[PDB]
Amino acid sequence: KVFGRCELAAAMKRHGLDNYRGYSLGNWVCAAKFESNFNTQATNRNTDGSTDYGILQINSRWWCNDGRTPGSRNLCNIPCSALLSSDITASVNCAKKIVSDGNGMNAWVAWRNRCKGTDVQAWIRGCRL
Ligand code: NA
Numbered sequence: 001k002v003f004g005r006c007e008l009a010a011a012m013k014r015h016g017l018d019n020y021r022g023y024s025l026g027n028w029v030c031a032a033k034f035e036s037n038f039n040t041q042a043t044n045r046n047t048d049g050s051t052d053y054g055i056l057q058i059n060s061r062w063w064c065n066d067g068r069t070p071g072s073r074n075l076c077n078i079p080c081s082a083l084l085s086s087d088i089t090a091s092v093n094c095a096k097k098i099v100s101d102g103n104g105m106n107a108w109v110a111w112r113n114r115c116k117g118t119d120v121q122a123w124i125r126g127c128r129l
Pocket of ligand 1: 060061062063064065066069072073074
């Protein structure tokens, strides 16, 4: 599924991401835009052989099991394939654990590089929430 901007903002809010660990909804929508372009099926291989999955490009190195990331963990207790569903529940649940890990949204390098400090409210401007 490719979400619309206000559609994803609505789904993230309903799943309780809005102000989760103090991060406004606009931060999560900005992160998703640059990680996945709002595509739940997005996959990207890392140099270390781990893979990133779904709207929020969650890494098999720590968070999900894909069966091909040697010496990795599965701290969200899910197959990485669950992070590609049209239903964003698994991605949101796993993102809540990641952002609680101690470095907040800095865990998402694209959030640090492209969203952090910017007018993130623009990402939910005109959305019926
Ligand atoms: Na893993």
